[PDB]
Amino acid sequence: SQNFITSKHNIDKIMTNIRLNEHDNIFEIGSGKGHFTLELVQRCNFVTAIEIDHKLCKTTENKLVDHDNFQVLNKDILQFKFPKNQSYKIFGNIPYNISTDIIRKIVFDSIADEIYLIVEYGFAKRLLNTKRSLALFLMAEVDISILSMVPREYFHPKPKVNSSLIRLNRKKSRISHKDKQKYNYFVMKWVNKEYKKIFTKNQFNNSLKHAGIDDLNNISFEQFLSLFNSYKLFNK
Ligand SMILES: Nc1ncnc2c1ncn2[C@@H]1O[C@H](CSCC[C@H](N)C(=O)O)[C@@H](O)[C@H]1O
């Protein structure tokens, strides 16, 4: 959909939590009518706006008349190819219907070291939930933080639920590239509670004890990595 945040007053509040600096190159997902894009070119070194809506690219361009450090590409973020030998960060007020696809695309198919996104409130909560697959796959590559709540009244058309500003920070991957397959399988089996397909009854117990997991309905990412580790040990 297209839910713009156009109040200068609200834009400043949100920018308050976004610590991007003058030397960062930025890729914005969905510049829309250019409201955040205008603040990013003033705050950052350079900004590449990726907008699917051909018209909005023009509108974005008109709003950025007095600025030079940017460009607006009329592409689909889902098919975009990010730099591989460059330092850059990402910002984006994104559509809910493809948030998953967008986050997977920018976390697994880009090397942005820091990502700022405005997403649906509930969506943001699921991202921190170790009971869901997406959360576990993402936590192996980035640290996730919910920075603030963005009231639905800040948007127009006004969505049904509130949104959240989240921050994703790249870190040294906790899963080696050679364990991608085995980690993928493990994650899926664990979130579906198909314990018997990855742990014998005794292996299961020892692993939880070893990981220090008292509540099987409340585990930290660290406790999960412990499990994935024991899983490997039991099948090397
Ligand atoms: N797959 C995709 N690739 C690039 N842009 C997309 C996209 N799907 C939606 N968009 C664009 O992302 C925006 C979502 S709303 C964000 C509007 C803007 N940041 C503002 O508040 O002014 C729209 O401009 C929409 O056209």
Short description:
With 236 residues, the chain is α/β, with parallel strands linked by helices. The chain has helices spanning 8-17, 35-43, 54-63, 99-108, 121-127, 133-138, 180-191, 201-211, 221-233, and strands at 25-29, 46-50, 70-73, 89-93, 114-120, 142-150, 163-170. S-adenosyl-L-homocysteine (SAH) binds next to helix 2.
Give the secondary structure arrangement, pairings included.
Elements: H1 8-17, E1 25-29, H2 35-43, E2 46-50, H3 54-63, E3 70-73, E4 89-93, H4 99-108, E5 114-120, H5 121-127, H6 133-138, E6 142-150, E7 163-170, H7 180-191, H8 201-211, H9 221-233
Helix pairs in contact: 8-9
The structure holds S-adenosyl-L-homocysteine.
Q: How does this model look, in words?
A:
The protein has about 240 residues and is an alpha/beta fold. The protein has two domains: about 1-125 and about 140-170, 3-Layer(aba) Sandwich (Rossmann fold); about 125-140 and about 175-235, Helicase, Ruva Protein, domain 3, CATH 1.10.8.100. It contains nine helices and seven strands; from the N terminus they run αβαβαββαβααββααα. The protein has helices at about 10-15, 35-45, 55-65, 100-110, 120-125, 135-140, 180-190, 200-210, 220-235, and strands spanning about 25-30, 45-50, 70-75, 90-95, 115-120, 140-150, 165-170. A seven-stranded mixed β-sheet has the order 3-2-1-4-5-7-6, with helices on both faces. Helix 3 (about 55-65) links the parallel strand 2 (about 45-50) and strand 3 (about 70-75). Helix 8 crosses helix 9 (about 220-235). The longest helix has 13 residues, at about 220-235. The protein is elongated. The site of S-adenosyl-L-homocysteine has 20 residues, from helix 2. One of its GO terms (biological process) is response to antibiotic. One of its GO terms (molecular function) is rRNA (adenine-N6,N6-)-dimethyltransferase activity. Belongs to the class I-like SAM-binding methyltransferase superfamily. rRNA adenine N(6)-methyltransferase family. It is an enzyme of class 2 (transferase).
